[PDB]
Design a protein around this ligand. Structure first.
Ligand SMILES: *[C@@H]1O[C@H](CO)[C@@H](O)[C@H](O)[C@H]1NC(C)=O
Length: 259
């Protein structure tokens, strides 16, 4: 769809990409405006995340790492759709089965830690982010938080299709996706990243969010804002699986700590 984003938005996407890619390396060199809180971890699924707080921007940030282990790779491959029973009001919503196990395996930690921060800082916004598997963790987390808190924002990078169209439509409503001027769900893709094409749509999967498609060389002026139902932006490129475009967002490779 539309060429170019503002520098303020581009900076924000870069910031969330940095946090997402740092999650692969114990949060190396994240912005100095961020206080690191408690680690989120489950041993059966190897889901890793943290709760963070940025007082300068008045947000509580929850980040999940993406795939960093054989266990994570196993989760990635479970494409069975599972009812999103977390959110009974999400009518007919179903999510990627592996990422649902991931979500369940950390839910109590996420909800308790977010609750603790939000109780103390009740005016702060809630932001969720991650890359790849971490991006789908972020989507399911942000869905849950949106049912009980105000001002939930979701920034994903290289996100798989996280669930069915019912789930996408729920997210589109909850995150004001009907305009790029109001969206609180920024689904960031890069060049021909293959992960945003999986699971295939024809298995009953769909994306939500406004897509922000980064074309190389990366910059605000070379990022596209993609909406509606046509096959376009990243998904049109037909990338296959985990490829170079998937690993490196805004010049930052997962875990590399070059920022
Ligand atoms: C896939 O995940 C679902 C839960 O979302 C689980 O019930 C199912 O057993 C998993 N499939 C496999 C092969 O483990």
């Amino acid at each position: 769809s539309t060429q170019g984003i503002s520098e303020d938005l581009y900076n924000r996407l870069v910031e969330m990409a940095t946090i997402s890619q740092a999650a692969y390396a114990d949060l190396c060199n994240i912005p100095s405006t961020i206080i690191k809180g408690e680690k989120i971890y489950n041993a059966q699924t190897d889901i890793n995340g943290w709760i963070l707080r940025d007082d300068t921007s008045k947000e509580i940030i929850t980040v999940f790492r993406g795939t960093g282990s054989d266990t994570n790779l196993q989760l990635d491959t479970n494409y069975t759709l599972t009812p999103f029973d977390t959110l009974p009001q999400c009518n007919d919503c179903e999510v990627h089965g592996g990422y649902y196990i991931g979500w369940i395996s950390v839910q109590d930690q996420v909800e308790s830690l977010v609750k603790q921060q939000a109780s103390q800082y009740p005016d702060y916004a809630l932001t969720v982010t991650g890359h790849s598997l971490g991006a789908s963790m972020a989507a399911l987390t942000a869905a849950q938080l949106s049912a009980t808190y105000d001002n939930v924002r979701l920034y994903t990078f290289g996100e798989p299709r996280s669930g069915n169209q019912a789930f996408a439509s729920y997210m589109n409503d909850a995150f004001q996706v009907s305009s790029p001027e109001t969206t609180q769900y920024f689904r960031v893709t890069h060049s021909n990243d293959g992960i945003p094409n999986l699971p295939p749509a024809e298995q009953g999967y769909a994306h939500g969010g406004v897509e922000y498609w980064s074309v190389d060389p990366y910059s605000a002026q070379n990022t596209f804002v993609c909406t509606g139902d046509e096959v376009q932006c990243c998904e049109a490129q037909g990338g296959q699986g985990v490829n170079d475009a998937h690993t490196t967002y805004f010049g930052m490779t997962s875990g590399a700590c070059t920022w």
